[PDB]
């Protein structure tokens, strides 16, 4: 029902670490400022995604016990979660309140990014579904930590070690859902269900990127490592 002093400590620590990210306004101001070509949008995305991976690795190393994990499992958790964490952060940003008509222009600008419309449709449906859950900053932060510390990733040698680190975060999130959303008792389950939908962005991620209407698909060395691109 109520958070323990240790849980409040864990929550505030995750929040502090999560807030080191670029502010939503910094991202939306760039997109809303002017209409960019498909070529300019591709480079905006690679710069944003490169910054996201850097901030993600810093957030990940601060997660309690992450530094005690086997080094190869550490890489597996990062590569396994990077795309999902990016889309969860994009969903958070998309759902931030902006002046009247700005969210319509933001949506239209994203649809004009330069990628195939078959990749745009599930993106907006996921963003819309995240939006209806009216998640707090603490829920987005804990869910991001839970996504990173998923023991059910490919090439993980010691799944129990990861499971041990994920369990306290799941416990805090469940309590928060019971506190914040007491009228909706399926809220915690609702949030964990979203994580299964997040995983769908994985398989066709490289394809979505190579579909960008640009002459050259140049990615930064960091993006080549974390994503399945050359």
């Amino acid at each position: 029902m109520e958070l323990t002093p240790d849980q409040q400590t864990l929550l505030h620590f995750i929040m502090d670490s999560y807030n080191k990210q670029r502010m939503p306004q910094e991202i939306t101001n760039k997109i809303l400022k002017e209409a960019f070509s498909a070529e300019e949008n591709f480079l905006i995305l690679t710069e944003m995604a490169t910054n996201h991976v850097q901030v993600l690795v810093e957030f990940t190393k601060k997660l309690p016990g992450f530094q005690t994990l086997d080094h190869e499992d550490q890489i597996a958790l990062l590569k396994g979660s990077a795309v999902e964490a990016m889309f969860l952060r994009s969903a958070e940003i998309f759902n931030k309140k902006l002046p009247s008509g700005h969210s319509d222009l933001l949506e239209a600008r994203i649809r004009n990014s330069g990628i195939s419309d078959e990749y745009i449709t599930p993106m907006f449906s996921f963003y819309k579904s995240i939006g209806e859950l009216k998640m707090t900053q603490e829920e987005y932060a804990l869910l991001t930590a839970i996504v990173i510390l998923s023991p059910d990733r490919q090439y993980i040698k010691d799944r129990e070690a990861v499971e041990k680190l994920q369990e306290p975060l799941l416990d805090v999130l469940q309590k928060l859902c019971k506190i914040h959303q007491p009228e909706n008792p399926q809220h915690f389950a609702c949030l964990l269900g979203r994580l299964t939908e997040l995983r769908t962005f994985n398989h066709h991620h490289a394809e979505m990127l190579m579909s960008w209407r640009v002459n050259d698909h140049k990615f930064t060395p960091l993006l080549c490592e974390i994503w399945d691109v050359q």
């Binding site: 690795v57 990940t60 080094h71 550490q74 590569k79 060395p221 960091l222 974390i226």
Partner: peptide
């Protein structure tokens, strides 16, 4: 081989 991720994880 993923030396950039390995670098960012092992730095500091």
């Amino acid at each position: 081989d993923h030396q950039l991720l390995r670098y960012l994880l092992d730095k500091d």
